[PDB]
Each structure stands twice: as structure tokens, then as C-alpha cells.
């Protein structure tokens, strides 16, 4: 069976997808069907119904990957190389592209209340520049936070430096603009959806960042 080709026996017991729960399958049946309908209509990704659908997708996908970023990246490996993936899930790379942009717009809608028009335009473009590098970083942050790596060590500062590079990629290099983004996240729970980040890993990261920013 399909997940057994990609997950160890121990991983399979903590992977919700591997349950073939009937209710979970029906939920994804509806999520896929709704995405198919919006795509076939060429629905713009910033329409409310698209943003709402993408928000549901990310909520469900985080739950069904057990909140483990490494399980998310395993699914991405399957979308690239598992022949049965479309047949078994109904999810396609084109569909994922639509959800990705609608989920981006779900965050741009919130950032619009904190940024001016020129900052919003910059981020609407550059949000996508390095977006797909975040799951690898999140996995490396989970491992670091797990092993109580010193946030101030060279290995911790390399992680903070990788965060800054991905953050400045979407936010820009302006200090006042960056502070708007950091304030918005503190104020808006939706901005940390679709991240696989936990309060524990965020604390570890924000300690590493704080060391980087004061120095
Ligand atoms: C806000 O910024 C910050 C931060 N920020 C962050 O830490 C931060 C962290 C991470 C992130 N991002 C991510 O991790 C991230 C980025 C990209 C992705 N993408 C993917 O994985 C890609 C594409 C995209 N996209 N694949 C998918 O989506 C994907 C979609 C669906 C499936 N589905 C299936 O296989 C199914 C359903 C099977 C099935 C089965 C059975 C069935 O019956 C039917 C179906 C599989 C994969 C996902 C997550 C982020 O966002 C950029 C952040 O901002 C931190 C601190 C501060 C501060 O201020 O201190 C701050 O400001």
C-alpha cells in the first residue's frame, strides 16, 4: 500500500492519513471537489471563497500530518515521485499551486491592515520567492528545539540567519517595515497557520532571533 512505501512502521502509527478513516476521507473528498470547482471556473485566488477553502486545507493538512513538518515534506516527496498519488488522493500539483496562492492571499488580506500599499505590493510579489524553503527550515528548527540547542550557539545562529534570509525575502530589508510584520504576527493568530510551528519551537527561534537582532 501507498503510505508503506514512504513511511516507516513506527511513523505509520502516528500518521493520521494512514488510518483510512472514513470521515477524514470524506472531508478530503469535499476539499478536493471544492478546489476542482474553483479551478475549473478560473476563480481568482484572492476571492473570499478561495481564501476560505485554502484556510480549511491548511488546517486539515496540519492535523492530518500530525503537526510534523517532516510528514508534510514526505507528502511533497510523494507528489513528486509516487505514481499513485493523484489516483489515491485526488490532489494534483496544479491544485496545490492554486491552494498555495489562495493561502498566500489569506495572509495578504491580514497584512493589508498593517502595511501600506507599497509594502503590500512588494510582499505580494516576493512572498513566493523562497516560500517552498520554509518546511525544511521548520523541520530543522523542530530538531534544534528538541535537543535544547543553545539558541546563541553558532549552530543556533545559523538557523536564525536562515530565518532572517527567508523573512527578509518576503518582508524586505527595511527595519520599520519588518517591525510591522513582527507586530502583526503577535496580533494575528492566522499568520502562524500553515507553518507547522509550535509555541515551543517559536520560543526557541525567537530566542535565536533576539540574540541576532540585539547584536
Ligand atoms: C510570519 O512570519 C514569521 C514566522 N514565520 C514562520 O515561522 C513560518 C514558518 C513556516 C512557513 N511556511 C511553511 O512551513 C510552508 C510553506 C509552504 C508549504 N507548501 C508545501 O508544503 C507544498 C505547497 C505549498 N505551499 N505542499 C502542500 O501545500 C501540500 C498540500 C496538500 C497536500 N495534500 C495531500 O498530500 C493530501 C491532502 C493527501 C490526501 C490523503 C488522503 C485523501 O483521501 C485525500 C488526500 C500535500 C502537500 C507548506 C508550509 C511560513 O510561511 C512562509 C512561515 O511564515 C516566524 C516568526 C516570526 C516573528 O516575527 O518572530 C514571523 O514574523
Residue numbers in the entry: 0 to 214
Report text from the authors:
In this work, we characterized the MerR-like drug-binding protein AlbA that displays a high binding affinity to albicidin. The molecular target of albicidin is DNA gyrase (topoisomerase II), an enzyme essential for bacterial DNA replication. The structural homology to TipAS suggests that AlbAS is a member of the MerR-type transcriptional regulator family. The crystal structure of the drug-binding domain AlbAS revealed a tandem architecture with the NTD and CTD representing structural repeats of each other that are connected by the extended helix α6 of the NTD.
We obtained well-diffracting crystals for the AlbAS–albicidin complex and solved its structure by single-wavelength anomalous dispersion with selenomethionine-labeled AlbAS. Model refinement (1.7 Å resolution) converged with excellent statistics and geometry. An asymmetric unit contains two copies of the protein that are virtually identical with a root mean square deviation (rmsd) of 0.6 Å for all Cα atoms. As postulated from our bioinformatic analysis, the structure of AlbAS is organized in two repeat units, i.e., the N-terminal domain (NTD, residues M1-R112) and the C-terminal domain (CTD, residues Y113-E221). In contrast to TipAS, which binds its macrocyclic ligands in an N-terminal pocket, the elongated and rather rigid albicidin molecule is accommodated in a central tunnel of AlbAS thereby pervading both, its NTD and CTD. The binding tunnel is decorated by residues of all helices, except for the N-terminal helix α1, and exhibits a predominantly hydrophobic inner surface. The building blocks A, B, and C of albicidin are surrounded by the NTD of AlbAS, whereas building blocks D, E, and F are enclosed by the CTD. Residues F16, W27, W133, and W162 are π-stacked to the aromatic building blocks A, E, and F of albicidin. Besides strong hydrophobic interactions, a salt bridge between the carboxylate moiety of albicidin and R181 of the CTD might play an important role for the orientation and fixation of the ligand in the tunnel. Importantly, the side chain of N75 of AlbAS forms two hydrogen bonds with the amide proton and the carbonyl oxygen of the central l-Cya-3 (Φ and Ψ values of 66.0° and −128.7°), thereby stabilizing this specific conformer of albicidin.
